Symmetry: C2
Subunit: 378 residues, 2 copies
């Protein structure tokens, strides 16, 4: 009877189901029956033939895994060729790929802050960045959403020499845009570093999909470090940290989620290298995902044009919000559903994620389904 030490998991499940928060998995078949407006495969590249070719060619050339840490034997010519390709596309001096976006965020923020330093964090930050702040062992100040003045005051009063301001370029919570130039003006005045996660800007912002930093003209600044994922626009798996040449050499030397991980599979690096090749050659994809989002905003009754791929549809009640998500699926459309604790109380919503590859008949099914489901929920 080793029942006691795991019996508390049952009480947590009762309480989670009591508040209607218990998350479960659905299982997706290879040929999907239902239109997907819930993934973050923004450019449709996960199943593009070129992307299939890149992963397979890497896989046959290099194997199924890196074989070990990049600090021992896992660093291939493929890894460094992609790092050059990504950095050049993004306008950065250097790039370093991690096994995932989550470990890229842990690795970058922890190694550039650390004990005795200050981190200024946005209150709506992605969980990967909140965990990083906990792991850095730095002193952490959390500012109101996109409150540049709050950032200014926190930096001006710090006794710590080194400070990192952390933010998303395109926020995963709401899809709004970070005030990158203002935030950066505050950092340089205070000698602080600016860390920017462009997981939702890459492939989406910029006229050629190069991210919000590039778009606002901050790409390559000596005091800006960028993180991104390879699993959204670039259709693959992995994380990446980008910035000055010294940052890469620092992460190799001290970032714990880089040294003591096995490092990104070749097939994922090959896949993402092809996907970046397609984006570079078909930059209209970054514009189509923004266009489809706008149509999704109009459909959903959102009056202001979306600046990012994902549309938020504030239903305002959790059971109503979940109810709408379930009715869409039954009608052939898989949509995203955020309820507390993900969003504040009373702001339960659907997320409609645009993809560059959406066709006109698929949008008419989105018009048909979302209109009917939302008009009932309304």
């Amino acid at each position: 009877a080793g029942l006691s030490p795991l019996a508390w998991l049952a009480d947590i499940e009762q309480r989670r189901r009591a508040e209607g928060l218990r998350r479960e998995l659905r299982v997706r078949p290879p040929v999907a029956a239902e239109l997907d407006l819930a993934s973050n495969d923004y450019l449709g590249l996960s199943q593009h033939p070129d992307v299939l070719d890149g992963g397979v060619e890497a896989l046959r050339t290099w194997g199924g895994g890196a074989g070990g840490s990049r600090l021992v034997t896992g660093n291939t010519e493929l890894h460094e060729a992609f790092e050059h390709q990504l950095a050049s596309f993004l306008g950065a001096e250097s790039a370093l790929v991690f096994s995932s976006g989550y470990t890229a965020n842990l690795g970058a923020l922890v190694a550039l802050s650390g004990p005795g330093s200050l981190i200024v964090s946005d209150a709506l930050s992605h969980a990967s960045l909140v965990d990083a702040c906990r792991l850095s062992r730095a002193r952490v100040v959390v500012s109101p959403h996109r409150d540049v003045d709050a950032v200014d005051a926190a930096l001006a009063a710090r006794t710590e020499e080194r400070a990192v301001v952390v933010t998303e370029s395109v926020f995963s919570a709401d899809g709004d845009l970070a005030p990158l130039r203002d935030l950066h003006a505050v950092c340089r005045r205070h000698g602080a570093l600016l860390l920017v996660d462009e997981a939702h800007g890459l492939g989406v912002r910029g006229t050629r999909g190069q991210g919000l930093l590039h778009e606002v003209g901050l790409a390559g600044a000596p005091d800006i470090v960028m993180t991104t994922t390879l699993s959204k626009a670039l259709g693959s798996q992995g994380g990446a940290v980008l910035g000055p040449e010294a940052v890469r050499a620092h992460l190799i030397d001290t970032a714990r989620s880089f040294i003591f991980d096995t490092g990104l599979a070749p097939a994922a690096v090959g896949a993402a290298s092809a996907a970046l090749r397609v984006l570079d050659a078909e930059p209209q994809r970054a514009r189509a995902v923004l266009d489809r989002a706008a149509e999704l905003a109009t459909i959903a009754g959102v009056t202001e044009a979306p600046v990012s791929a994902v549309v938020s549809v504030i239903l305002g009640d959790p059971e109503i919000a979940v109810g709408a998500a379930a009715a869409c699926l039954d009608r052939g459309v898989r949509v995203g559903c955020f309820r507390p604790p993900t969003v504040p109380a009373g702001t339960s919503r659907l997320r409609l994620a645009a993809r560059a590859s959406l066709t006109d008949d698929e949008m008419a099914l989105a018009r048909q389904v979302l209109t009917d489901v939302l008009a009932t929920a309304r």
Copy 2:
């Protein structure tokens, strides 16, 4: 200029002390005999493993497309999880993007505030990071000290307690006293969490891990973590245990929910490797044999219990020189110095692989005998 100019001062201090890491670049045709990778079964470049990855890539695409809690959970993910749990003798399995996020997700989600973690002093970095993230009260126990764990559990004020250890420790390659530890957890009502990244494919008569080997597979009070990137030649992590544990991690583990979920190519690769190991249990026995063979070469007196042989040189610069003299003669070996290993214990690491041939061993015998006899004069 200001906020990153401090990195140059860190580069000066690190390089002056000879600890500065750099990344070397590997060609598709390796130039050297490789004794530093943890591809224990040689399955990363195996034809079936390559096929399983290519087939997963063509059927499903290059990535999962999102977190498994939204649209990334494929039939392939859940088929490999069933395949793995059956092989391991566990009730359930859940695969992560890496062994590192598996360790964060399982330990943090099963401890949390108001709980107690008893951690082994030689714990892997992914385990150290988890304790920092759990916000539990963390007691670090002396290495494999069952009595200290018992006393720590006996005096605690927290109702829920997790004793965390690796089955095969990454530091030294020794084995955890799992049967003794589990009796103590049972006496005090604690959960036993075991990271089997270096036991999978290595311990057990069929490579099923140390937990399986000692007869503790499937226990209601044992949670297991492992990686898919060592023996199974791929990418990913996995947490295994009772069904309620999988359901809990899906519901609360942040490094599961808010990561994108393992690429199909990695799952297909790993499912193919698990098939070859299942069909070739001799691959597990062979890595211990090759390790023993490497131990005799190196002058190590006790037979290895894991794949990687430690060769203690007690001098940092000597260890660095020995690895360089090995590399220059065509052999890649591991090189560890403080603060990575304890002070006074700078060493080489020689990782055995099931796919090592007797001719590669003859080159290791000649080069290691020559370098080591020079380094221990």
